[PDB]
RNA sequence: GGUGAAAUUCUUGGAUUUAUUGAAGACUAACUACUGCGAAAGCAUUUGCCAAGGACGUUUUCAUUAAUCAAGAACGAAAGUUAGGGGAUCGAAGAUGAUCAGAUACCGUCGUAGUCUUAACCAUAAACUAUGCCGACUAGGGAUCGGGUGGUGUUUUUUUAAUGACCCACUCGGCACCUUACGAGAAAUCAAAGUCUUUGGGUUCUGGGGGGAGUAUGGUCGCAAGGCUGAAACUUAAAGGAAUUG
RNA sequence: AUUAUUGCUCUUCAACGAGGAAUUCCUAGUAAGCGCAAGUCAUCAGCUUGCGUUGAUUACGUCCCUGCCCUUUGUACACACC
């Protein structure tokens, strides 16, 4: 399993119809300088660390 | 009383234009009154762009999007496509956005 | 009632009156 | 419990003489049997391949070509010219608002006698420095251009069958000749040959058909 | 490189069609439309359904031996809606994601010089 | 297949799909616009023929020949009627599947007349700018169509031109929009709906509270459907317009 | 005091093995668990009004559902969509 670690760069805002989902841009600690925006589940502030179970994918808007 | 100087729409110095059928309800309607929209969108989509070039031959190919004109009946143009509704002087704005 | 149905109303009516009067021509 | 795949014969398509590559693709028929074999049955059907797949260069990305099969020998079937079309995306693109569209055509014969109708399409262009937003032609303009294109097109055909005609259309010889006579009238961007179709072909003539093969 | 054939997806509303044929077209293979892989009768055109249909379609494609295909995408056309149905987008994706090959696709939707009065009459379909 | 969802419906008759090719009739997509033309209805593929027209140009010609018009007359969307042709499509009628308490409907299927054309009728549409025509005067603005005039304007190179397209300024006549309002109006709004109690340029037409009623009657036109002309008795305090707040 | 006001003792030892479709309340000394005083009261709280004790989980958001407000818009309603 290719585990991938990424630190939260920024809090973009709440997605999802219900709204319990947050858009966040992250930077991987291993091999930095690239940023991907990921959809979270729980509560999130800046400088958290998200474990991305699959390295390259992303999403934007939810219903 | 008269709520539009353009009456319905866009006809002066003619008196008869020819009707088009609405792309939704198939209602007849004059071409000058038509409320028309060009639909330009890729054959592929948001998600399918990556998986396309991946399993496809050629160096990134072309990506030739589809083009067609759309005509609405003002009942359908209000029910879905560009309508909203506007205040007394917001009506007078012909700016596209 | 709608104007144009009221028109068709008296149109019928006039034909029947036209009809009936012919009996006595 | 049949599965015609375990039955069907296979084949491979060979292209005509001058484009780039004569190798095209594959087809499925049936075993050749007495009383309705695989030969006289289908064969001469047609194949539509983009000539940019045929030529290989992508400046040719539009312009589809129809290849009709004629004769067959030994798991090799050679084809010829059934016509030429345009890609819908290109045409639907070239057509833009705020400008004048101009089309014309002619029915015309050739040496080895192939009757055909070629089309033409051209749009007016703005001139650099032009302030007004549309740039429409004068309808007297339009009639003349149609006449000249008609004048030009009638000459190019009837030279040497479709053979040299094929050779003529490919590197856009006509497109510029139009543009040359045209410029004395109106600016006119685009200007391609668009569609060309065939209607009446001559007799088979097994000999002349093989002139493109080797 | 590969062996070429034609895809020709007809995606309408209320159903979706995907069937590959020889490049000549006279000889076809493996149709399996979207109304085959579910019956709600309202679900026949769904993107989910067209995927499942694109699965069985890509199957026999390789099980025969077409390794590559060109697609011609199509709507109802004629005097009809002219807009591509929902299940044509999923279908293209699901037949590309099958590991098959793609190149040079266009739109074959029939578009008239228009004529032949559209159905539903002058006052339109009204409900 | 079709829909919100279904069903009538089509499928060993290989439906739906594909391919090559053919037939019939209709329409003229995109280009198409606050753009063109015609008395209005109306007019959008190509080319040939036939006659017609406005604007402009004009140190040409005639010289009041004109403006507007009861009677009268030419044209007149769609539908409809007569007699041939045509009859792809969509489809008043009718028959069905559904929905509904009902559902003679809306939605779906089939589909007669019709839709097209020839020869004849019919003369009506919110036939609308709901706004007569000719003349004069009164105010600012940028686009655009046609004609014309001005140029040591730009671009097309061939050797400079000549042309052609394009730019700038002017000027006639167009279809329209913008901003104002001196002025007008019950207001909505209006370069006319302005130059009206400081009330008169010429001329045509219509209305005089609401219903009754475009009814009755006569005349007249029509094959028919119906068109044109068109009252009264009686009844009634409102009907109506624009705008404001709810 | 029988149709048994309440209390006490012995005996009798039911359903109920976490509850279908649905639906209520709630963000910190709060929720939930727990008893107490007061109202009523001659007698009778499985009710309510307040009280203190023990003391969490999870949000710290959105407009998807539901409810209601706000503009815009239409009106022939003004006894105002009953
Ligand atoms: Mg109103
Ligand atoms: Mg109009
Ligand atoms: Mg009219
Ligand atoms: Mg008698
Ligand atoms: Mg409705
Ligand atoms: Mg055309
Ligand atoms: Mg018929
Ligand atoms: Mg019926
Ligand atoms: Mg019934
Ligand atoms: Mg009935
Ligand atoms: Mg009238
Ligand atoms: Mg009007
Ligand atoms: Mg002015
Ligand atoms: Mg000049
Ligand atoms: Mg004012
Ligand atoms: Mg529980
Ligand atoms: Mg007590
Ligand atoms: Mg109580
Ligand atoms: Mg109001
Ligand atoms: Zn509509």
In chain D, domain spans: 6-214
Instruction: Order across the sheet with A35-39: list the strands.
Output: A35-39, A21-28, A4-15, A49-52
How much distance in Å is there from the Cα of C23 to the middle of ligand 4?
5
Residue B49: φ, ψ to 5°? -70, -45
Closest nucleotide over all strands to B5 (CA to C1'): F129
The two tokens of residue D32 are 């050749």
- Contact criterion met (CB below 8 Å) for B48 and E89: yes
With the C-alpha atoms ordered E112, E113, E117, E123, is the resulting torsion angle positive or negative? positive
| Ligand sitting nearest the alpha carbon of E127 | 5
- SS3 (DSSP) at A35: strand
Query: In this structure, is the CB of residue A16 within 7 Å of any atom belonging to strand G?
Result: yes
How far is residue D191's CA from residue D182's CA, in Å, rounded to a whole number?
10
Cross-strand pairs, A38: A24
Cβ within 8 Å, pair E23-D46: no
Q: CA-to-C1' distance for B12 and F148, Å?
A: 27
Helix extents (H) in chain E: 47-64, 87-96
Q: What is the DSSP letter of E74?
A: B
Closest nucleotide over all strands to A41 (CA to C1'): G61
Q: Where are the beta strands (DSSP E) in chain B?
A: 19-21, 28-30, 36-41, 66-71
* Domain spans, chain B: 1-97
How far is residue E86's CA from residue E83's CA, in Å, rounded to a whole number?
9
- SS3 (DSSP) at D11: strand
Experimental method: X-ray
How far is residue B72's CA from residue B28's CA, in Å, rounded to a whole number?
10
E111, E115, E119, E122: CA torsion to nearest 10:
130
- SS3 (DSSP) at E112: coil
Residue with tokens 């025969």: E64
| E63: number of Cβ within 10 Å | 11
Interface test with B, best of D54, D92, D93, D97 (most B CBs within 10 A): D92
Residue A6: φ, ψ to 5°? -140, 130
Chains in touch with E (3+ beta-carbon pairs under 8 Å) read B, D
- Looking at the partner chain, which of D58, D61, D93 has a beta carbon nearest the beta carbon of B67? D93
- SS3 (DSSP) at D75: coil
* Domain spans, chain E: 1-127
Cβ within 8 Å, pair E106-D29: no
Residue D113: φ, ψ to 5°? -85, 105
Q: Please list every residue in chain E whose beta carbon sits closer than 8 Å to the beta carbon of residue D87.
A: 106
Query: In this structure, is the CB of residue A42 within 7 Å of any atom belonging to strand G?
Result: yes
Q: CA-to-C1' distance for A35 and G59, Å?
A: 29
Give me the resolution in angstroms, 1 decimal.
3.0
Half-sphere exposure of E118 (CA within 13 A, CB side): 24
Please name the residues in contact with E16: beta carbons below 8 A apart, sequence gap of 6 or more. E9, E10, E33, E34, E44, E45, E49, E50, E53, E85, E86, E87, E88, E91
Question: Of the candidates D64, D149, D134, D154, which has an alpha carbon nearest to the alpha carbon of residue D102?
Answer: D149
How much distance in Å is there from the Cα of D185 to the middle of ligand 14?
17
How far is residue D171's CA from residue C7's CA, in Å, rounded to a whole number?
71
Cβ within 8 Å, pair E23-D53: no
Q: Which residues of A27-58 are buried (b: 16+ CB within 10 A; e: fewer)?
A: bbeeeeeeebebbbeeeeeeeeebebeeeeee
- Contact criterion met (CB below 8 Å) for E118 and B70: no
The two tokens of residue E106 are 């266009």
How far is residue B16's CA from residue B5's CA, in Å, rounded to a whole number?
18
Residue with tokens 């209320």: E14
């Amino acid at each position: 399993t290719p585990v991938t670690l990424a630190k939260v760069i920024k809090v973009l805002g709440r997605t999802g119809s219900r709204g319990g989902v947050t858009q966040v841009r992250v930077e991987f600690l291993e091999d930095t300088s690239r940023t991907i925006v990921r959809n979270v589940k729980g509560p999130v502030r800046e400088n958290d660390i998200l474990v991305l179970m699959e390295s390259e994918r992303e999403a934007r808007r939810l219903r | 009383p008269k709520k539009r100087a353009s009456n319905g729409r866009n006809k002066k110095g003619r008196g008869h234009v020819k009707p088009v059928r609405c792309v939704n309800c198939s209602k007849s309607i004059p071409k000058d009154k038509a409320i028309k929209r060009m639909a330009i969108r890729n054959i592929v989509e948001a998600a399918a762009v990556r998986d396309l070039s991946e399993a496809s031959v050629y160096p990134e190919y072309a990506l030739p999007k589809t083009y067609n004109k759309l005509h609405y009946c003002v009942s359908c143009a209000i029910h879905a496509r560009i309508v909203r509704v506007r205040s007394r002087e917001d009506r007078k704005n012909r700016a596209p956005p | 009632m709608r104007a144009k149905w009221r028109k068709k109303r008296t149109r019928r009516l006039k034909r029947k009156r036209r009809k009936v009067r012919a009996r006595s021509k | 419990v049949v599965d015609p795949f375990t039955r069907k014969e296979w084949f491979d398509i060979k292209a005509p003489s001058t484009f780039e590559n004569r190798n095209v693709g594959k087809t499925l028929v049936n075993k050749s049997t007495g009383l309705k074999s695989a030969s006289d049955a289908l064969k001469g059907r047609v194949v539509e391949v983009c000539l940019a797949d045929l030529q290989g260069s992508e400046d040719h990305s539009f312009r589809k070509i129809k290849l009709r099969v004629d004769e067959v020998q030994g798991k090799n079937l050679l084809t010829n010219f059934h016509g030429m079309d345009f890609t819908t995306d290109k045409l639907r693109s070239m057509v833009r608002k705020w400008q004048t569209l101009i089309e014309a055509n002619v029915t015309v014969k050739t040496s080895d006698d192939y009757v055909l109708r070629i089309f033409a399409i051209a749009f007016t262009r703005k001139q650099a420095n032009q302030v007004k937003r549309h740039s429409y032609a004068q309808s007297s303009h339009i009639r003349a251009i149609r006449k000249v294109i008609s004048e030009i097109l009638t000459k190019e055909v009837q030279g040497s069958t479709l053979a040299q005609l094929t050779s003529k259309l490919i590197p856009e010889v006509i497109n510029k000749e139009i543009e040359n006579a045209t410029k004395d009238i109106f600016p006119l961007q685009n200007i391609h040959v668009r569609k060309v179709k065939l209607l009446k072909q001559p007799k088979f003539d097994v000999g002349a058909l093989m002139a493109l093969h080797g | 490189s590969q062996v070429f054939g034609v895809a020709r997806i007809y995606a309408s509303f209320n159903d979706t069609f995907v069937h590959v044929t020889d490049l000549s077209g006279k000889e076809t293979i493996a149709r399996v439309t979207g109304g085959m892989k579910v019956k709600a009768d309202r679900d026949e055109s769904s993107p989910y359904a067209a995927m499942l249909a694109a699965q069985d379609v890509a199957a026999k494609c390789k099980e025969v031996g077409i390794t590559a295909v060109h697609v011609k995408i199509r709507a109802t056309g004629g005097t009809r809606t002219k807009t591509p149905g929902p299940g044509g987008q999923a279908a293209l994706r699901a037949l590309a994601r099958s590991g098959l090959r793609i190149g040079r696709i266009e739109d074959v939707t029939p578009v008239p010089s228009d004529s032949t009065r559209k159905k539903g009459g002058r006052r339109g379909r009204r409900l």
